[PDB]
Every structure is written in C-alpha cells, then in structure tokens.
Design a protein around this ligand. Structure first.
Ligand SMILES: NC(=O)c1ccc[n+]([C@@H]2O[C@H](COP(=O)([O-])OP(=O)(O)OC[C@H]3O[C@@H](n4cnc5c(N)ncnc54)[C@H](O)[C@@H]3O)[C@@H](O)[C@H]2O)c1
Ligand SMILES: NC(=O)c1ccc[n+]([C@@H]2O[C@H](COP(=O)([O-])OP(=O)(O)OC[C@H]3O[C@@H](n4cnc5c(N)ncnc54)[C@H](O)[C@@H]3O)[C@@H](O)[C@H]2O)c1
Ligand SMILES: NC(=O)c1ccc[n+]([C@@H]2O[C@H](COP(=O)([O-])OP(=O)(O)OC[C@H]3O[C@@H](n4cnc5c(N)ncnc54)[C@H](O)[C@@H]3O)[C@@H](O)[C@H]2O)c1
Ligand SMILES: NC(=O)c1ccc[n+]([C@@H]2O[C@H](COP(=O)([O-])OP(=O)(O)OC[C@H]3O[C@@H](n4cnc5c(N)ncnc54)[C@H](O)[C@@H]3O)[C@@H](O)[C@H]2O)c1
Ligand SMILES: [Mg+2]
Ligand SMILES: [Mg+2]
Ligand SMILES: [Mg+2]
Ligand SMILES: [Mg+2]
Ligand SMILES: [Zn+2]
Ligand SMILES: [Zn+2]
Lengths: 258, 254, 258, 253
C-alpha cells in the first residue's frame, strides 16, 4: 500500500554541494522517490554529470556569494514554478583549518564564509520562495561536531557547524506555523574511498576514531540520503527544529562495544 | 513499496493509538504484524485488519512478555522489529504531593519494567539472528519537564530513554539497533473536543508547541517505519524526538 | 569580600547515603560552608562516624521505605527547625545488575527500589517541609549514564538514573515559582582507593574507560561536593531543572586528547 | 579567598555580565584585567576593581593579542579568561529582513572574537599548564525563538560548539574551557519596558519556569564557580544558567 517511489512525486528539490558525497547520494535518493532535482555546485563538470544522471538541472554556484545563491534558487523557481525542498549542504573542511593554535584568520574566515554564511544565504533565498508558497522543507547540513567536540580539531569547521545547528533550530521554530519545516542534518563521519584506503594503511589512526563510534564504521552517503528524504517528506510532518543526528551512536556513547 | 517486505514486527499496545497506527503503516510497507495487547477485543480486531497475529500479553509480566516474542518467533520464524510501545498514564499518578506508592509503582511496572522485559525477550531472538530493530516508546517528557506533572509517568519515560540509549550502544556491533521514540503530545477525538470546550487549557499547552497542534498517531507511525527500516541503518541509541519542535523552542510563533 | 565559609551558614542539609563516597564528601563541604548536616544512612556505624566528624546528626534510614524516608525528613525538621537543602543521593550498583541478558527481575527491581523509588520518596518528603517554608534546594543524584550509554551496562542502574534525571527536571520546572529549586547532579565515574588499585593492576580495563574521558581520570568525590555546594547555595539561584553534568567532559567528547 | 592571586581577563568587562563578574571575581581575591571598547567606562570599571584597563576591539587580532599579552606582562600570567564581549544590534533581526552587512558584523564581533580570544588565552595558558576559559554563548545556542535575531543565534551556536571542542582538546593540559549559556538578563531598560508592555513580557516569561530574567550577579556567580577549582572536573560544558528555560514544557503559574 505504501510506495516510497512516489513519496516525493512532483516535488522540486534544490541541493547545494550536489555533485558529490552526501549531496549526490541525496540527489539520487530524492529522484528515486519522484523528485525533480536542481543540482547546485561549484564544479561545472561534476555538476553537469550529476544533473544528467538525475535527469535534472545544473546551476553553477559559489555558495559563499549572495548573487550566486540567489541565482540558484531563483533559477529553480523560474524553471519549475516552485521550490519544495532545499538541502543546504555545501561545505568544506580544508587542511589549513585545523587546531586553533595553527589556524590563522584567512583559514578561519574562508571556512565561515563557505560553511555558515552559505547557509544563511541559502535559507534566505529558499524562504523567499517558500513563504509565499505556504510550504517547504529545508534541511541544513550541520554535523555531529555541532554536538560533540574533538581533540582532533578543525576549529573553524566546528564553529561553523555549531552556527548552522543553532540557526536551523531557530528557523524551524520561527516558521512552524507558516507551513514550513527547517531541520539540521547532523551526520557522523562519512566514508570515502580515500578514507577506506587511509584507514587500512593506518589502523592505529583509524582505531583512535572508531573506538568512539558504536557501529564501528563511518556512514555511507546513502545513509544520510535516506535521512534527508525522510525529512524532506510528509513522513516528517511533525518534525521541525530538529538536531537530527545520523551518527552511528557517537553522541550517545561512553564505552563502546568490542 | 515494500520497504519492510517480509519483515516480522511485534508491537505491544498494538490495538490502540500509536501502536495501531504503526501496525497499519508497517503492514503498508509489507510487514507481518504481531499485535500484543492486554485487550483481546481490540487486539483481535487490529490483528484481523492487519492480516496479522493477535497474542494476549500483560507487558508487566515476564512470562507474558517472553510468550509474546516466543510465539511470534515460533509462528513466523523470526522477529525483525520490536516496537515496545505499551504504556499507561492513569489519573492516580499526578503531582508528586498527591501521588501515593500504589500509583507510583503501577506506572513503573507497566511503563518501565515492561521495556526491560520486552527488550530482554526481543534480544533473545534477535542476537542469534544477527539483526533487529528495537524501537522503545519513551516520551518528549523524558527530555522536557512540566508543571502539569504525572511524576511516575515522567520518571518511567526517563528510564526508558536511558535504557534505550545504552542498549543501542551495547549492541551496535551485533547488528541490532535500539532507539527511543520520543513523541510530543498526541491528538485524539477526545482531546480535540476537550480543547474546543476549553481554549484556555489548550492555549496553555499549544503556546509551547511551534507547530501549534498535537501530533497525529500516523505521524509517529511514520517515524517508527523509518527507524524499523534500513533507511535508519546508521541510527542507533537515538533520542528520536517527534515533538513538533517542543524540545527546541523558547518563544513560539503566533 | 566573598567568604564561602559562610555561604550556607545556618542552613540545614539532609544528605542520604551520607556516610560514604560523594555523600560524605558533600557533608564535609556543606559543613565547611556553615551548614548543619543530617546524615541519613542505612549503616549505623559509618553513619554515626560521619555525623560525628561533621558535628551533625545521624538518622538511620532505608531510603527504599516510605516510613523511614518520612522519618528522616520529619526528624531533621523537628530537630533543627527546617530542611533548607536535600541531597537525595543514596543509591546502589550491585553486581547482580549487569548486562540485560543476564539480569533477572529480583536484581532489576531491587535497583529500581533503592535508586529511583527512593528519590520519589525523598523529594515527596523534602517538599512537605520546603513548600510551606517557601524555600529550599533539592539536589538528586542521577549519573552521566542518564545522558550517555555504555556497552559495559548495568541496565537497571542506567534506567534508574534516567528516571531520576527526568523526575528532577520536572520537579524543578513545577516548583520554580514556589521558592524551590530542584536539580539533578550527574557525576561522571568517581574514584576510590579500590578503583585506583584496580586500574593500576589492569591498565587494559582502565584505558577502555579513560579513552572516553577528556580529563583522563575519574572524579574525586570532593569535586562532586563542590558542585552540590554550588547548587545548594544562592549562587545557583537561576539554576533549576538542570542536567548538571560534572563528568570531566565525557558527555561532550568524540576523540579525546592523548 | 577562592580566587586569591588569580589573574582574570574579562572582555566586555565595563558593563553588564562582564562588570558583575569583575566585581565577583575581585571579591574572591582575583586581579581583574578589564578589556573593553570604551575607555571611559573601561577605566571606571578597572578603577573600581583595583585592576587594569586595556582598550580592545575584540574583532581585531592584533588588539586581542595585545590584551592578553599586556595582562601577562603586567601581572605575570593569565589564570582566567572570561571571553564575554558580544553585541545584539537591531539590524540583526528576522532572516528575511537581515542583510549581509548586519550578518557579518555580528559574526565578527560575537564569534570571530571568541576564536581570537581563545587563541590568545590558550597561547598563554598552555605554558603555565593551567587555566580556565569561560566563553559567553547563550541559551539561544540551545533553544530557538520566533522572535529571532538570526546572526546572533548563529554566532552563539558557533561559540558553544567551539567551546566544547576546545574543552575536550585541552583537557589533559590542565586547562578547562566551558560555555556559559545565560538565559535572558534583566536591565533597568527591560524592567521599565516590561511594565509598559505586559503583553510583551508575558509572551517571554511564560517560557521561563522561574518567571523572571536573570540578574547579572547570578551569571557572575556561575563564572566564579567555573573559574575556580570548584569546577576542576567540568570542561566542555554547555553551562546553562537559564531559569529552567531549556528544560521546560508547560510552566507553573
Ligand atoms: N565526514 C563527512 O564527510 C561529514 C560529516 C558530517 C557533515 N558533513 C558535511 O556534509 C556536507 C557534504 O559532505 P560531503 O562528505 O558530501 O563532502 P564532499 O566534498 O564529497 O561534497 C561537497 C560538495 O560541495 C561542492 N562545493 C564546495 N565548495 C562549494 C562552494 N563554494 N559552492 C558550491 N559548492 C561547493 C563541492 O564541489 C562538492 O561537490 C558538508 O557540509 C560537510 O561539512 C560531512
Ligand atoms: N500524548 C500521547 O499519547 C503520548 C506521548 C508520548 C508518549 N506516549 C507513549 O506512547 C505509547 C502509546 O501511547 P498511546 O497514546 O497510543 O496509548 P493508547 O492508550 O491509545 O493504546 C495503547 C495500548 O496499550 C494497551 N495496554 C495497556 N496496558 C497494557 C499492558 N499491561 N499490557 C499490554 N498492553 C497494554 C492498551 O490496551 C492499548 O491498546 C505509550 O507508551 C505512551 O506512554 C504517548
Ligand atoms: N562512579 C560513581 O561512584 C558514581 C557516578 C555517578 C553517580 N553515582 C551515584 O552517586 C551516588 C553516591 O555514590 P557513591 O559512590 O558516593 O556511593 P558509596 O557506596 O561510596 O556510599 C554509600 C552510602 O550510601 C548508603 N546507602 C546504601 N543503601 C542505602 C539505603 N537503602 N538507605 C540509606 N543509605 C543507603 C550507604 O550505606 C552509604 O551511606 C549514588 O546514587 C551513585 O549511583 C556514582
Ligand atoms: N539577555 C542578555 O543580556 C544575554 C543573554 C545571553 C547571553 N548574552 C551575552 O553575554 C555577553 C554580555 O552580555 P551583556 O548583557 O552584559 O552586554 P552589555 O552590552 O551590557 O556589555 C557589553 C560590553 O562589551 C563592550 N564591547 C562591545 N563591543 C566590543 C568590542 N568589539 N570589543 C570590546 N568590547 C566591546 C561594550 O563596551 C560593553 O561594555 C554577550 O556576549 C551577550 O551576547 C547576553
Ligand atoms: Mg577535509
Ligand atoms: Mg492519562
Ligand atoms: Mg557497583
Ligand atoms: Mg540588542
Ligand atoms: Zn568516546
Ligand atoms: Zn515553552
């Protein structure tokens, strides 16, 4: 009776950072549930390729720029008449952003611009279309580091995601009687081919992290995709302002199982 | 369709409210539902509607909880999903000043002991299978306190939350996820009528709910289907709040 | 001009489980700040010894019994005039309560009786005195395990402390306009001479726990005593319903420092 | 005597919570360095506390470094840092009505400032092998509101997350880092305003179990606790002093 293949039928979803990682996994999952996907990404090559795969739309965007972000959402609304879903997901974690002791202001500010400012811009743009429409679901990518701190610190990254979480929560409360939901996706660490190789080459480094993850592994991007589809859908109609942790138990755990 | 195709789900308190709505939703995704309930009349009717199995149970008794899961497993071969959901909120459990020991203990027996029994029995079956999803019904009151207190109820749900979290951590490498469903207040035809005849009482609660309304049982059912499924494969030990923004809000929108 | 040796001058404090551990350390600290301490404990030998050291009063009590708990607080109020502070701290962690697979009902229920029912009884009794007096500060001992789960589980203990936390929070909210504050003390693991010897002999068992504690050690009971003195005092006048974590950073930490 | 001899740097120390905290730390024996943007009120606060005023814009790296370097060269060390400077300007409001200059200004003064202040404080505390840092976040880092100041809220969420991480990171170097999260704080201005507009007051107070805003002295008491050895097993804390706000559904009458 319940077919998930039409859960997002006819819904227009904008995804930033959509050409890779959880952004691309999410694009595939929303498309599989019937959504029309607008891929916004800084890379025109991988961006075009993603949109082609999803039978969707590519708009090039630097999410740290107000004009680019407005253009993304405005192009989406002009093309399809509406924006139903916004997955405000673009973010970076560059090597120059590290321990507070060795992280200088250019690194600090660049990460804020691309990770926190971008979410302010993206929410403002999405709301410009969603509010007069009387409906919408916004998912902002924060992180489990918005709730849990680490000795292996990337200090501007951590602050930016804390900012994303608190802003997401407030927006969710603010717009809760205007037909809109806003939620913060807080992923645990996410697996990549590069990490899989690195962890195999350095078991000590891997174990230093895995000992704090009850499930004993990083997330696959498809697992985050499943959560965004849930939040984007009417299955999450009573969920707004959420600290939506998909972290394999990290935030819940003291001593982990063997 | 068929996110839960072939899966066997045991639901306690499955004959009413969230339990019943969840039964319907899991069935719609392909699950076989075993309805465990103290009420044989509504229990049989729910199982008949879901094309499932009704099994009498008193969730406060070890023999009965063990028989519920044993019967589900012997009948269908396995228990994939346990929604340990049965609970009460009797009027004799109220403000701590007026709440006496019989009421205190009855609520602990039915709401907290029951989840220990149900998880112990579910795990007996799930651990050798190497897979399972357990959803325990706590409450948003495990996270938020209220002046309109039912004190044993609140303590029991805090206990459910903490135990759920720990079981989730403990079994995370044995293929079994454990999560605490924490609903906000749930709507009923009765509450809908009461709130209409008494807008002051309604407002006193609704002013703390951003969405401005109680949940529908179907909305909790949607969350349990998510948690029961592989869509939540990286979610365990969760304080899974489905509360319309209650735990997140200071000043609410008009 | 701030002298803490007078912060609780004349205040009457009832401490359950006052003969040992955190309870005893807290008695010393409250007394050092000028309080009159009523030591409620099941053990008359250590109970009397504590009250003698604290220049206070020992009152025998089984905190799992309504009559005994009512007698403890009624005796404190009759003997010293009032109950200003209640530190509802008595609790047990017996070995028969362990992993859920191996934990039978008598152990389950015994821990619920002594750890959770006891806090209901103790709060109900303290409030009988504090409400008419229009003032009071109640501190209930929960645990960091009310917030964080462990694979090394004592399942009834954990449930009991989750129950204590939620009840404390609700009581704190409920009585916030009646001159009373109620807060949950949530200690991390606390050190003992026994534990220090056990960890020295068994570095493996030790590191399995310490790797999740940013401070790198268990708490000393005096550190919890200092938190209770704060919560009992007017220095915590705007703190009620708190999940008051004194846990060396456990609930906050992913990867810990070396 | 709890803070006898300890040197405490307080940004925003010339008014509000910063000033109340200066008085409390002094009353426990601390030496207070008042870092503030206004020299006249700054010197006034320092003179009262028998401390030292250092002029500083906490959004400037060179000025923040000078603040902590001057504290260390004058009194030998920095034992306590209360990184408390922040603003809540009206230009920062609902997200629909908040432009980029307003957004960025609040991030600069509220969040960047805490990164700069922590970097400088830690640089001094690490050699000493001891120190206690208290960063002022807010209860809005934990609870959202429809009456939104969106950059402020974001900045304070950032302050909380960064405080938590630093507290974890430095926990085995004898340093503690904690986030003070105050509820709404009373002022004479607010007090008169809530009298003239009781409907406005009621809209907020119905979410506060204690039924009032905090007095700055109450926050000062919490900072003194965190600054002291009484909080030696507390680090990385979301230290809520919010009258029960983050804990409450239906509030008492
Ligand atoms: N361990 C993790 O990967 C992890 C964990 C938790 C949260 N997150 C967050 O999830 C989001 C994506 O994670 P991911 O693993 O998929 O990373 P990813 O590198 O695989 O994807 C990031 C995408 O964003 C694009 N992008 C980068 N800068 C951009 C800019 N200015 N404008 C527009 N697009 C830009 C990139 O081209 C890239 O396609 C990030 O916000 C990340 O911080 C990641
Ligand atoms: N506002 C809410 O309804 C709300 C909010 C949060 C959490 N919860 C919790 O959700 C769960 C379900 O709530 P609901 O409103 O749907 O309840 P409900 O009263 O509508 O139906 C629950 C079922 O539990 C059955 N039951 C009662 N005692 C039993 C026992 N000893 N053994 C076996 N079955 C028994 C009842 O016969 C009934 O069919 C409960 O645990 C509740 O505490 C409810
Ligand atoms: N690692 C830890 O020690 C730790 C951590 C977090 C929370 N806690 C909790 O802190 C509280 C105190 O812990 P502790 O380590 O200081 O205990 P303790 O064993 O060192 O002291 C025991 C005291 O409690 C008394 N007691 C036991 N049962 C009693 C009963 N029915 N009635 C009256 N008194 C009774 C004992 O006789 C004694 O007076 C407990 O509730 C504990 O669960 C402990
Ligand atoms: N309701 C509240 O007041 C409340 C609640 C929670 C958190 N907070 C936060 O507590 C902290 C202090 O609050 P307050 O009420 O005492 O504010 P306040 O306005 O009374 O004091 C702020 C001080 O900081 C100074 N200052 C401003 N900008 C500066 C700059 N660039 N560089 C150096 N100094 C500067 C000011 O001169 C002033 O003395 C702030 O961070 C605030 O956001 C306030
Ligand atoms: Mg990176
Ligand atoms: Mg009821
Ligand atoms: Mg023990
Ligand atoms: Mg302002
Ligand atoms: Zn850990
Ligand atoms: Zn509220």
């Amino acid at each position: 009776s319940m077919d998930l293949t039409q859960r997002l039928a006819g819904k227009v979803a904008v995804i930033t950072g959509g050409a890779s990682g959880i952004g691309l996994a999410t694009g595939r999952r929303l498309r599989a549930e019937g959504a029309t996907v607008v891929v916004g990404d800084i890379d025109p090559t991988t961006g075009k390729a993603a949109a082609d795969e999803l039978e969707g739309l590519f708009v090039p965007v630097d999410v740290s720029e107000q004009e680019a972000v407005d253009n993304l959402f405005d192009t989406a609304a002009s093309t399809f008449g509406r924006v139903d879903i916004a997955f405000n997901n673009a973010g970076i974690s560059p090597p120059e952003d590290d321990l507070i002791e060795n992280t200088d202001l250019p690194a600090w500010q660049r990460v804020q611009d691309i990770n926190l400012k971008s979410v302010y811009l993206s929410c403002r743009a999405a709301l410009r279309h969603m509010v007069p429409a009387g409906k919408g679901s916004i998912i902002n990518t924060a992180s489990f580091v918005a709730v849990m701190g680490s000795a292996t610190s990337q200090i501007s990254y951590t602050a930016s995601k804390g900012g994303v979480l608190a802003m997401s929560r407030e927006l969710g409360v603010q717009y809760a009687r205007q037909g809109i939901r806003v939620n913060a996706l807080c992923p645990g660490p996410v697996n990549t081919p590069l990490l899989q190789e690195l962890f195999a080459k350095d078991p000590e480094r891997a174990a230093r992290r895995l000992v704090h993850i009850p499930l004993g592994r990083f997330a696959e991007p498809e697992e985050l995709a499943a959560a965004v589809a849930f939040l984007a859908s009417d299955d999450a109609s009573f969920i707004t302002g959420s600290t939506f942790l998909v972290d394999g138990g990290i935030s819940s755990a003291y001593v982990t199982p063997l």
